[PDB]
Design a protein around this ligand. Structure first.
Ligand code: CL
Ligand code: CL
Length: 162
C-alpha cells in the first residue's frame, strides 16, 4: 500500500464532472475544480487544467495525471508549511501518508489548524491524538474516511485499508 492507492480508495475515480460531499465541482480522483456553484465555471476550470476543450469529460490517463500533480503539490505544500513540516518530519512512513491524505482532502491551511492534534502527533501520543482528531467537523462529516485515516495515525499500519 502507498499514498496513491490509499487516496484512490478514499476519493474514488470519476471521469465526468461531479459534486463532492460538500457539493463542489470535482473530477477524476478528488480533483476539486471550483467552489463556485457555476457548472460553466467548472467546465472552464477543467479545460484550463487539461489543456483542451473537454466538455466535462476526461480520460483515465488525464485523471491520473491530475492526481499525480495533486499528490505532489500536497507533499510539497506540507514541506513548505512551518507548522506542518516539523510534524511530518517526525513521523514514520505510514503515518506520513496519513498526513498527506488529510492535506489532500482539506488543504494545508485546514490541517495546519489542528494544532493540538499536531502536537500530540509530534509527541507520538497516538491514542490521544486519535481522540482529539475525532473532535472535528471533519470526522462528523466524513466519518468513514476520517476513521480510516485516524486508525492509520493511531497504529502506523495499513490495516484500515485492509
Ligand atoms: Cl491544475
Ligand atoms: Cl466518509
Amino acid at each position: 500500500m502507498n499514498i496513491f492507492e490509499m487516496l484512490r480508495i478514499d476519493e474514488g475515480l470519476r471521469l465526468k464532472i461531479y459534486k463532492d460531499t460538500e457539493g463542489y465541482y470535482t473530477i477524476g480522483i478528488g480533483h476539486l475544480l471550483t467552489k463556485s456553484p457555476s457548472l460553466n465555471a467548472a467546465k472552464s476550470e477543467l479545460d484550463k487544467a487539461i489543456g483542451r476543450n473537454t466538455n466535462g469529460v476526461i480520460t483515465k490517463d488525464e485523471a491520473e495525471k491530475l492526481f499525480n500533480q495533486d499528490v505532489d503539490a500536497a507533499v510539497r505544500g506540507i514541506l513548505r508549511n512551518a507548522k506542518l513540516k516539523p510534524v511530518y518530519d517526525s513521523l514514520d512512513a505510514v503515518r506520513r501518508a496519513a498526513a498527506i491524505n488529510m492535506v489532500f482532502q482539506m488543504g494545508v491551511t485546514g490541517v495546519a489548524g489542528f494544532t493540538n492534534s499536531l502536537r500530540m502527533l509530534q509527541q507520538k501520543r497516538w491514542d490521544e491524538a486519535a481522540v482529539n482528531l475525532a473532535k472535528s467537523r471533519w470526522y462528523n462529516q466524513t466519518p468513514n474516511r476520517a476513521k480510516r485515516v485516524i486508525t492509520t495515525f493511531r497504529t502506523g499500519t495499513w490495516d484500515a485499508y485492509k
